[PDB]
Design a protein around this ligand. Structure first.
Ligand SMILES: *[C@@H]1O[C@H](CO)[C@@H](O)[C@H](O)[C@H]1NC(C)=O
Ligand SMILES: *[C@@H]1O[C@H](CO)[C@@H](O)[C@H](O)[C@H]1NC(C)=O
Ligand SMILES: *[C@@H]1O[C@H](CO)[C@@H](O)[C@H](O)[C@H]1NC(C)=O
Lengths: 454, 454, 453
């Protein structure tokens, strides 16, 4: 059950009640497609049906040409955030594929998949991989296609032999279009890279918990968007690429989303107002005794009450950062603010409603679709829940509120920007903390007092 | 069309006038359904070749259908000086529509209204009257043409023309699923698979707007699609329904202008003794309801040669006196915004009808013609050159191109305002401010220096 | 072969050893698909094999009509710190508007009547090599025109549907892409430009044969850096402009800069001052100056070669190279930023990983087989990738380039220790070495005279 609190005193909001799925590990597997080494050229005859085998046979040499160029390439992920300088996310799959490039690794695959279509392959340089045959084009091409090419005089048969070769190429050709427009590395993992059957199975044969197995299966569209598929080789009549799947080694811990907006004084004199915005907006999830914080919006994906994030894109904070929602002046964690003189209207749509910051002569309203205007916001920072509100307007900008189901609570309090004397309030867009502003106030009180010695 | 441009030397900036507005203020939503037929009975022996083909194309028909059910189970969304934005949700109104279709009993209501015909308005329940279109009727084809073949245990293997025909009639159904599954069921731009021009043009032409707005959308169908969303909803009870959300241009043929700025720095020799200044709120500006809507980010507004298509969701409402800054940056009615610094480095900005060059220090700043070559060499300072004679511009080892789009430019002569500032008290840490807010900081230092005269 | 130096003095590393491939110019060709002008069925009847062709002709027309809506829609893309703004496809938009002039198409069609490849001088001075990649007009006018465009029309065989589909394929995909991409696409696909045409088009380019091997062996990078521009479908020919890159600077040294926060390690929270070298990214020697590429996307790497678009560059003095040898040198004023944020973090370099660790933070470095092999102390420290597979700072795990290369550790005393914390401007001052000196001296000035009593 999702609930939201609003803190009038700091113009912030926490959406509590969520449940974590935090990627911690990776699960790589190798997917092979066995290709039949069709050499070159057709059979003496230009029957339009033989002309048609050519065209579709021209596609297969071309698909192989592209996959041959991506093998030779050095794959790499082309995907206020100066706190992040992260590395690669496919370092583990590149780690398998550079070893698939070693001479003699393809025969080690061909041995393991001789009786089965899935086995764990013990190959060179100290890595095991689950390798899976998903497609056997060797059986087809060399059995009921190649003799019609193995015949220097091919009488093209009934037409349905051209339709069928279109159908067994189709997937391989969809694979190559993805790889070829993504320099080898594709995300999300499509259903042509890994069909539901194969994926729902590959998860099943993942050594994970029953907790993690049921979570991934019920969230397959979430899994594919945070997985990778990585072209590796086409070599010795086999195509292979590595797939890189997320491992959610944190589950069902509490998460919450912080929401923030400017908190300013509301004096009539123009320019003479100072502002205050808590600045660590984003996702927080309890993790391993600390708090994992995801400043990027793009990093986390919600499926109705569960937050899937990638710990690579996160900052580790002590659990006392939670106190920043209890009391910003607590002596245990120096809460982050930043100051300014910019009292400009702006509304933040939260998880269960909207923070509205209205200053000056700005028209700020909250509305129901059938009822009409149900609130007009005064200067200062207010909030409206999502019971009865469908939209919020600030000036001429229209914001839709979330209508999912949850209890809000409005937590009263005095706007803390009232606790500061403006004359010595540092407003030069100063991204600091609570004490580091007090850092400057005592200096500013003293810098005036020292010149008061006469 | 007709586009003009004034380059202001006094402040190292330009404004392009003559554009006319089309600002998105609302969403027109429609329900697009493709009737299906519920089959799971692939019982057929038919070892002969023309059954394997129909078996395989049919299999594609189920794994698409399965992909689409997982999407019904999902909850989609989007995450869409450029920071002040309004954080909202682009597709909240089409998700409202899609919630009712998840209620049980809503599909018959659709089938009741859409029984004979293709386009009707459907009262679903609790505040939903939605235009629904039936864009393809597979059920008839599958009960009438394809059920006789597969569903009989005889399984009379129909002509090869059936294998090809069924491929035609899956293709749209099969491209739609590709698009939804790799975008998580929200797509943009709305693609022709999702909505044809015949379909789109009709929906436009029967949008309850004026023929003007109809005439505008029909002649900018590619802009319209780029600003329209399509959200999958449900595949249920032999019906597939996806919600289509089309932009509604509530502000039309109001004047727009684009603001370009570049740094205005001094040209003293002793290096690092030069101060700078830069007008800040660059972007698109349009006249909108007695106010000015300002769209700081470039990916928002789209131009077709003289018409600017902006989404008001990503705008900032400003008083019509923000126009004063393009008249006099020292005006008393709007506190024009500037940011200041001491790092003076060359850079160039391509305007709508020319290019600003801000040449500073040891840099080679030129502007060339295609036929003649280098036709201008920038002395130190901020200057301008228009597209009447110039094709390109090089600043250091970087080359920009200019628009050969036709339009009268105007070089407005005047003295750079940073010559008015005494460098000793100039605030130039990296102050992100206004003219007066700067002047405020200038007064304090002067006051504290006047005191230090004893 | 690649190497990497870490500078303990200033918590930064430079990775040397790269060869530049800098896109300084463009190269436009026009791609044409000759089409046929054909209209409504005129086959009255509903034969099964005839309804298949009606669908396939409907796709043709719906693709032709949606192409037409692209020929009159102004095409452009939206292609970054103190970087300015340019327009990536103006070289191609130049040609595309000439093709809209009248007569240009018969001039094209004249030179390409017998040959598939020619150079055509259009009526504004500059000429363009133009090429013919699909001739459907002959196919629609010779093989199909008879059947469909006659009142009496036996559908000769079902194979007539198949080849019309197969001859239709590229035109239908070329229309798909141009439609989600408002007539300009990147990277260039093989539907837009197959491999043979591309290799050929490279072959005919006026470049060094060192340059031709470079593109030919990096086609996939070359495609990422090319654009495709929809121009016209009018008077029985579909023409779009391809704009391929001209890497006018080759075989010069490149290097990439990584930096991290360098703070003091007093135990008192907040009593620490930090220091970070700014302007991190890729640098390459270019024409007596050094082009700096601030954005990660602007350069694409193939192991020791860097392909960068110089539109998204900056031209810096070559003395900026001294900021890696002595950040106090009197010839170039090295850029830093001060803070009081002493957070632990890691940066993954070209050959290792920088860990700047602070507070009570657990920062290790681990091997796949061995486990932790180093717990970092409070400070800014480095580790080479021989031995190391991953790094953890808190609960976040970073992998490391396993790329072959040598690293050298340069010991020095952290510069953050050469500052009096009492007068150090640590209010997130994006400034330089001497600009920070100036705030210190001025602060030491108001300290100086106000303390004569
Ligand atoms: C001066 O310092 C005290 C503690 O040293 C701090 O709490 C206070 O906020 C400062 N003065 C003002 C007016 O804030
Ligand atoms: C500074 O204050 C004086 C009054 O002492 C005022 O006249 C002047 O206009 C102020 N400076 C500026 C730049 O407005
Ligand atoms: C600052 O300038 C004064 C000039 O009186 C000079 O004596 C002093 O050495 C300078 N600061 C430093 C750190 O050298």
């Amino acid at each position: 059950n999702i609930t939201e609190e609003f803190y009038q005193s700091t113009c912030s909001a926490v959406s509590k009640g969520y449940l974590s799925a935090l990627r911690t590990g990776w699960y790589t597997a190798v997917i092979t497609i066995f290709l039949s080494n069709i050499k070159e050229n057709k059979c003496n005859g230009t029957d339009a049906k033989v002309k048609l085998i050519k065209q579709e046979l021209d596609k297969y040499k071309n698909a192989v040409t592209e996959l041959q160029l991506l093998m030779q390439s050095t794959p790499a992920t082309n995907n206020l955030g100066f706190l992040l300088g992260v590395g690669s996310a496919i370092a583990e799959g590149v780690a398998v594929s550079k070893v698939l490039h070693l001479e003699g690794e393809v025969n080690k695959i061909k041995s393991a998949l001789l009786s089965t279509r899935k086995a764990v392959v013990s190959l060179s340089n100290g890595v095991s991989v689950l390798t899976s045959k998903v497609l056997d084009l060797k059986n087809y091409i060399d059995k009921q296609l190649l003799p019609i090419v193995n015949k220097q005089s091919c009488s093209i048969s009934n037409i349905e032999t051209v339709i069928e070769f279109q159908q067994k190429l189709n997937r391989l050709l969809e694979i190559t279009r993805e790889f070829s427009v993504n320099a080898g590395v594709t995300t999300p993992v499509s259903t042509y890279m890994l069909t539901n059957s194969e994926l729902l199975s590959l998860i099943n044969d993942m050594p994970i918990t029953n907790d993690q197995k049921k979570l991934m299966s019920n969230n397959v569209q979430i899994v594919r968007q945070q997985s990778y598929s990585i072209m590796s080789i086409i070599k010795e009549e086999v195509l292979a690429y590595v797939v890189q799947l997320p491992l959610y080694g944190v589950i069902d811990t509490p998460c919450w989303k912080l929401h923030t907006s400017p908190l300013c004084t509301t004096n009539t004199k123009e320019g003479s107002n100072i502002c205050l915005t808590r600045t660590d907006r984003g996702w927080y999830c309890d993790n391993a005794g600390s708090v994992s914080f995801f400043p990027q919006a793009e990093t986390c994906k919600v499926q109705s009450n569960r937050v899937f994030c990638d710990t690579m894109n996160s900052l580790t904070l002590p659990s006392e950062v939670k106190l920043c929602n209890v009391d910003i002046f607590n002596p245990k964690y120096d809460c982050k603010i930043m100051t300014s003189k910019t009292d400009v209207s702006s509304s933040v749509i939260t998880s269960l409603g909207a923070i509205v910051s209205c200053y000056g002569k700005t028209k700020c309203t909250a509305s129901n679709k059938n009822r009409g205007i149900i609130k007009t916001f005064s200067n200062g920072c207010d909030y409206v829940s999502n019971k009865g509100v469908d939209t919020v307007s600030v000036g001429n900008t229209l914001y839709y509120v979330n209508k999912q189901e949850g209890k809000s609570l409005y937590v009263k309090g005095e706007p803390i920007i009232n606790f500061y004397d403006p004359l010595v309030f540092p407003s030069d867009n100063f991204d600091a903390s609570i004490s580091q502003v007090n850092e400057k106030i005592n200096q500013s009180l003293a810098f005036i007092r020292k010149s008061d010695e006469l």
